[PDB]
Amino acid sequence: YDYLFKLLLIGDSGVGKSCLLLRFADDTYTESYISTIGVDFKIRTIELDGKTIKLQIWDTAGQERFRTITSSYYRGAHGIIVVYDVTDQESFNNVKQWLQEIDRYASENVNKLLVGIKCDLTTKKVVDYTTAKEFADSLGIPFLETSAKNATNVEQSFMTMAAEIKKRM
């Protein structure tokens, strides 16, 4: 490829990471051991301005166990997407803490995005748009609030991030 951009997907279990991962494909490579366990990343290739870009996104296995924000959260990625569940107050409270720290420790040029999602349509909203937007603004980080009903803006956010990363190098 002309480019390989590494994206980190940060979020707890059951908050809607699965919804965001629908914008990516499974890698088709396997061998015996990988077939038994699976992997924690997905991929997508796009052509942008005549160049081929591979996006590789890690929804890192076991991350929910280790919420001390160590370097694995803020080094070795071009973009970091942090997600909470709009139907779960504690999920938002947790993400405020993690994102504050990631923003503090990551290089300024790492692309960051906060996503509030309703991934289960049978659930009831709790976290106001304005509250989450105010938080994102306090850090100077883009914010996307989204529902599984329509993923157009999610798709848009990833395409924007890819173009921004490409430009910065």
């Binding site: 490829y1 390989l4 590494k6 707890d12 279990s13 059951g14 890698d27 490579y29 396997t30 061998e31 015996s32 051991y33 990988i34 038994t36 366990i37 699976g38 992997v39 924690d40 990343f41 591979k54 590789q56 890690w58 890192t60 296995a61 076991g62 991350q63 929910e64 166990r65 280790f66 919420r67 001390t68 160590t70 370097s71 694995s72 080094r75 070795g76 990625a77």
Partner: protein, 200 residues
Amino acid sequence: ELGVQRVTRIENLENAKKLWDNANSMLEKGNISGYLKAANELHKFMKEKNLKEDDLRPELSDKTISPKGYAILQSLWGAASDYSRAAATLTESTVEPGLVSAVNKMSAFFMDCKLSPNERATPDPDFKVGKSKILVGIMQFIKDVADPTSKIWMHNTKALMNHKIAAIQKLERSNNVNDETLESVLSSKGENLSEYLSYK
């Protein structure tokens, strides 16, 4: 459930518990290689017997992962996360990241058997294991479980693992281990080697 199905399930859960205990014991000993092997045996058995993490968790009520154990799990997690990403390069980004990520997922499975969703580990923040030691442990395990025909770019996978293990050990021998020198090994596809590596 027929009686035979109940008896079989209980027997299988009891055996899976024993395998989990063995993995936890290896972890407690700081035996990186032994832990990865035991975690794999647990995963293989649960798959074979059609048991899920949720089935085994109640059986583990009187068991604990120690702060030391959690520190080792965190070190393995951080190293595997970093390595999977470092190993994704323009040369190749499928086989090496896949193998490393599978190791990470396998360790996560061990924890999921014990912990409910989003329950946090409680690592000893002062218990350090060397990242270079952890990485070699991961590589040794990958060498063991990689298919003999597996390749990373133009090199045999097992042979490239041996090559990277040796490179890390040479860094240790010369007091030259840091995140940068380790990253150079992790991201390498041996593109400058004079011969393509084979295992046998």
